[PDB]
Amino acid sequence: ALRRRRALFEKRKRLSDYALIFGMFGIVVMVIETELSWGAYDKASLYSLALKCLISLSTIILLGLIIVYHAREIQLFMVDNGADDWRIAMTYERIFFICLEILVCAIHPIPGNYTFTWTARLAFSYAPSTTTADVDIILSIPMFLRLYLIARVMLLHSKLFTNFNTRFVMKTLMTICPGTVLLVFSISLWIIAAWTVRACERYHDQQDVTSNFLGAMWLISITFLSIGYGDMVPNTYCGKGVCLLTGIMGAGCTALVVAVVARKLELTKAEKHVHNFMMDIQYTKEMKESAARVLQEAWMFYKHTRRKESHAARRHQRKLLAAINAFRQVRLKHRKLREQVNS
Amino acid sequence: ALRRRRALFEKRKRLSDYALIFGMFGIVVMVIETELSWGAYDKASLYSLALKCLISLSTIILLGLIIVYHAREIQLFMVDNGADDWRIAMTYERIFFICLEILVCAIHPIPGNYTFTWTARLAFSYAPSTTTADVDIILSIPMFLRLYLIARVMLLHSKLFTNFNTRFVMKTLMTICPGTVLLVFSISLWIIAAWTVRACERYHDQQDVTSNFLGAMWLISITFLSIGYGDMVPNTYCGKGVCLLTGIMGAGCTALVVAVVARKLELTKAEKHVHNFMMDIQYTKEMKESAARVLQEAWMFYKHTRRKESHAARRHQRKLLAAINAFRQVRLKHRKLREQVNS
Amino acid sequence: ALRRRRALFEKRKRLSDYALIFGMFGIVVMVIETELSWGAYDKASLYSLALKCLISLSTIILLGLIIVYHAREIQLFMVDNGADDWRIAMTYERIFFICLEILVCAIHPIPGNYTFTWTARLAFSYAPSTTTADVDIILSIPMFLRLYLIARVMLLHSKLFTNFNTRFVMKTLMTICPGTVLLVFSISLWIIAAWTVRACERYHDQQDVTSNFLGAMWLISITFLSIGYGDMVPNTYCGKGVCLLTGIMGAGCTALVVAVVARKLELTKAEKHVHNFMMDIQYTKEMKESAARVLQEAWMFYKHTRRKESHAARRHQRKLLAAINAFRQVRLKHRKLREQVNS
Amino acid sequence: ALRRRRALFEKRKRLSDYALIFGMFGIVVMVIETELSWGAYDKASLYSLALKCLISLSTIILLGLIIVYHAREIQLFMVDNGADDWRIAMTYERIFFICLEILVCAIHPIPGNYTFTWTARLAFSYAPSTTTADVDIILSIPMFLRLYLIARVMLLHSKLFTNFNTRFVMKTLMTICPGTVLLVFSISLWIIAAWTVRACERYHDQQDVTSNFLGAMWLISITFLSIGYGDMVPNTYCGKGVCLLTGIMGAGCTALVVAVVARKLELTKAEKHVHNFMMDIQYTKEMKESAARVLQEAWMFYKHTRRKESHAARRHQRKLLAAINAFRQVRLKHRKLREQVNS
Amino acid sequence: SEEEIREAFRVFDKDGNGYISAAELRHVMTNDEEVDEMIREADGQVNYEEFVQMMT
Amino acid sequence: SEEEIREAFRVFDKDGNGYISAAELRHVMTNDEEVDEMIREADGQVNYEEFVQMMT
Amino acid sequence: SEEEIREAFRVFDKDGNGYISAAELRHVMTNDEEVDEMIREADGQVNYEEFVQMMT
Amino acid sequence: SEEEIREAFRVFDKDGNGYISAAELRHVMTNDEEVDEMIREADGQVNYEEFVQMMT
Ligand SMILES: [Ca+2]
Ligand SMILES: [Ca+2]
Ligand SMILES: [Ca+2]
Ligand SMILES: [Ca+2]
Ligand SMILES: [K+]
Ligand SMILES: [K+]
């Protein structure tokens, strides 16, 4: 009953934990293998076969974990709706999603040396360049799609979480902490996209322009902020696609900021009362000094009128009218403040 | 009467359907003819004459459909206002609009080989280039203006539709589905503008920079997001005009997003009540543990005071004050929550 | 009294009309003289002396009109505040503003041939270039500052206008017609800035890159939308300053649009009632068909249960549960609609 | 008691004043020394030793002022919480912040000639360049971090200031004066970043492209507005880092503007009443003339009907219907206005 | 059309008495023989029935 | 499931009498032998108890 | 100007009695011979009529 | 500090009787000898006066 349903929640919570451990382990070994395959050794070395076998070993384990995890999800569906037969839960939508996760998680560098001819025209020079690139680079980039397991772990481990769909979870995360969400994602995308641009463009860049990791972080950062490209224009279409992908995320992350820095500038009910109080004190003092200048200039006008001077009273009259105007301005500003405070 | 008026609605609904079929048929044959006229054969081939005759045959049929459609609109005006004479409905505004649709829909590649000298200076090199380009390319681009028949079909076939002007229809479409409108239009503009840039710039690009369709989609995409041009600067003024047109649409479509992602982040009345409940549970637990630390540190201060030690009670006093501060902070956060819930 | 004050309003209204006529006349003759001084003739020709004498003749007349206009403003100040002496109105602020208008309106190409050595390094090549440019080009550009008389005429001739400062007038113009203000200014800045870039950069551009007027309109347009520069990078610092000035106006005019397209997407009270009605009709029909499918699938489940088949009832049970879910979703959507309508 | 606490406020207010005087004095001498060290003399000259000794003398004095200032903050903590022992106030957080200020304020060009090999590849050319740059340039740039003393002085000297954290102080400064904050910071960042780009890139720029101060202000300005780079792409990674830093501040300062120009366009309660009144007067007159045209055209229709003419009455009937439509439109616009005024 | 004509007639009738006066007819034209002719052909005063008779 | 079936039955019962009629059963299918068969197997009228008996 | 002078006089009159005191005159100047001279030329106390007489 | 200690004591006192029980003392520690020792040193029950005596 309820105890059984809670048990299924625990197993479903545990499986997503291990699927994340093997999810990041497969990516980490891919990153180490890709970095070392360039200069440390060659694609046919025994080290390359060994490291590409750890990724395969982690992928087989991960795929079993995804199947078992969805099997637990089937059991939770059976308990919730009081059904027994498997087919009552194997809807068309669920089959597509199960197959999608398997396809995404089964893409990894297969052991064995396989190469393909890569041809791309250089940027700013339009000069063709042909190199025999390994096939493991077009399979390593999709491995970053395994990061969806981080979202699954987050939802299944959130205290507040446990309709409760991803829409409500993301929306409430943009209210409790709108800065952490827009900073962790921005920094994580920065490193992931910069390494992807460098990895795809280390074959067709011999001048160390974008192949440099520190130069690739600059290219991703200017593109994300939509500043421009400068001279960091990618040569390959993998580096162009990632720059475009960062540009799109750079126009949605600069649209959430405008919609978050607008709510964060408005004053709350408590802050408005404090703000009204301090302004009222300032305007009360201002009305005192503005009127004091009015009397001082008004009498100073009279004093020089009886002095039989012309230029004397003229200056005081000009100052008196200016003091009158400033006196009227502060009165209107004060009166508007009382109107807001009352309402 | 009412039955007659409904009949005019049906005929007006049917004519716009066929005008869209011939509207897209003329464009499709234009796209096929333009693509094949480059490498498959030449402008003087019998295939070019035949395909350019299907466009002319579709344009003559379409223009008759537009005249008949507006004739039905005249009859609907006669029934609605109870008038008989034609001239009572032939206002100056309607004549201009009828003529505008005819002029837009009558622009198509005329059969027969006609050429003009096209001269443009290359980008990033400022080197002039002259080629004898066919005249059908400056007539094929305006054919994309026939897409206004899609809007007419949408309005005349919308269940919710049937003042009901295009302003209200577009505004209500940005509320029911603000993502589909901003995605179908963005993708449709992507393919249309990218092909237009490639078609206009296949004469004055011999390095396969922007003439490549996949390279033209990148140029349109970076310009739409206002990232920059990089090395994809068009040589001709047709490719420069389309890039500018995409830039303008790229500053209005990134201004609707800011005004849509701002309404989509606010919490509804139902969501606010749920959000308040979960926060209240969290703060109730937080107040329990914060005060528990207060008592624990307060007594731990006393325990080491009687121990005749100096460094012992000092640490506990520092921790007690920090616990007091955190206890006060959670109380203020809780009290603010109750204020919002009550109101 | 009141009749006298109205008379001062009429004279003040008439003088600003003539000051605008001579304001645009001075600019127009400057534009014609600048265009013709390049190729039609030389700076020492008698035509250049004659045309530069019309600008001087219009400037002397204009400066007398500005002095007389401010003299009328003095009289209006005397009547309003009941003062007689001039000095009572000659405040420090007014003297600075009167002098500012005289200085702005007295800058025009002085008759006579005067030249200065202009040196600037080319863009994208960093190659220095030296030319003996006429001094009338650095005096023609400030002549566009006379456009402030258009604002003065607009305020003094607005029916709604006649505190009423420029802040309220501009703010109310962004509500009555936010599109016309953002379109007339955008187009007017487009032509003015494009001609200024071409005029300043016709000396140091021998490849017809930015000196072309149609190429200068593209440079101003991409900079205004903050897309980028491409290959249209100005060589001189006058063309760089104008591009920067257009960039700043291109970040404030794309910030007013976000704040205008956000108010123009919200539904009014009348539109909300209509929108609620049409949605309610749609949801009423949806609840009918969703429940009808519920009954149909529920009985279809029973019919195949008595048929002694296994795969038969399984499919109907799966469809029944999906129909139940969709039935629940439409009920929640309908119930939320009634909540909004009631409030 | 209270008098003692006020005394600690005065000493804390005075120390931050002197720490700002020496804070800007250290920066000013650094700027003068850096500018003169390039062409006026060399790094080993006695003038360089003397000027680099004024910075060291100002840094030692400043560090003593920061220690004493925080010592006063300790005493204020002792009085506020009624504690005596130092350790009760030496929390881990305070130690980190005290050490952070010391580390930031102790970075300055050490006297003595020290050089390091600086290597960077040129922009747009990818040609490596190696120069023996002085080590004082990588220590002069961090000296601009001493500007945090300006914020401390502002808070400690604000009349309104004297929870009152930096969040509330900054938020209330964006309401009282949102333009001054966004203009002083923008201009101050403009000069600081432009000089930093020029200073870091005067070694690896021999064509006077970005080393020119006026050319560096243009690069910072276009990057801040996210327009692009053009040909002003920095060669070194110090000039690239500052351009990136200005880009980030250029996407947050163009997000505050959108959230400030949106609050500054809404009409206040007083302005709405005035706006409603002037619109009502306009619509009252419009309803008079629209109906007057209705009667005039309606009777003009009758007059020509009895004239036995065909084309005569047809024109008047068409004008009458147009007048009827315009009469209905103004009635709806007027009625909507009354609805808003009542509510 | 009848409702719009009635609304226009009510707009003209500022005094609210239901009878439009010849002075009002002369006034609403400033926004000589024709007005007198229409007064004669519509009639010592004009009411709503005469207004709709002239409109039709 | 019982609550959802009850809600659907109430939606069908437009007249609010609590008894769904054969005419309503025929009508709710347009959005011949099968409807008559289900009427026979659910039964001179159908109530909520028969509805939940047929649903189960 | 009369309304503004009256408003300033009311602002000075904090006690609300309608008669401004010499102590208040001395106080409103801190935001010796001149104040005594103006007190003498405006007069044992100063009222609104004396205020508008001195203002004019 | 006294107000904060009083607030914490009230938070502990869930039953609202003003007397905190040893069971509550044991419970508020799970978020053996030490609790018994502090109970003995604070005392058959603990009140607000004992709470502020132990706090001070
Ligand atoms: Ca009358
Ligand atoms: Ca029934
Ligand atoms: Ca008094
Ligand atoms: Ca108890
Ligand atoms: K941009
Ligand atoms: K850009």
Residue numbers in the entry:
A (entry chain A), B (entry chain D), C (entry chain C), D (entry chain B): 120 to 281, 295 to 475
E (entry chain F), F (entry chain G), G (entry chain E), H (entry chain H): 82 to 112, 119 to 130, 135 to 147
Q: How is this structure described in the published paper?
A:
To enable high-resolution cryo-EM studies of human SK2, we designed a chimera (SK2–4) that contains the transmembrane and extracellular domains of human SK2 and intracellular domains of human SK4. SK2–4/CaM forms a non-domain swapped tetramer with four CaM molecules bound, similar to the previously reported SK4/CaM structure (Lee and MacKinnon, 2018). The CaM C-lobe is constitutively bound to the HA and HB helices, and upon an increase in intracellular Ca2+, the CaM N-lobe binds to a unique S4–S5 linker, inducing a conformational change in the S6 helices to open the potassium pore and activate the channel.
In the structure, there is clear density for the S1–S6 regions, but as observed in the closed conformation of SK4, the CaM density is weak and the N-lobes of CaM are dissociated from the S45A helices. Furthermore, the S45B and S6 helices collapsed around the pore axis, and the pore is closed with a radius of 1 Å at the intracellular gate at Val390. In the structures of SK2–4/CaM in both the Ca2+-bound and Ca2+-free conformations, Tyr361, located in the center of the selectivity filter, is rotated approximately 180° when compared with the homologous Tyr253 in SK4 (Lee and MacKinnon, 2018). Focused 3D classification of the S3–S4 linker was unsuccessful in identifying particle subsets with a dilated extracellular constriction, suggesting that either none or a very small percentage of Ca2+-bound SK2–4 is in a conductive state.
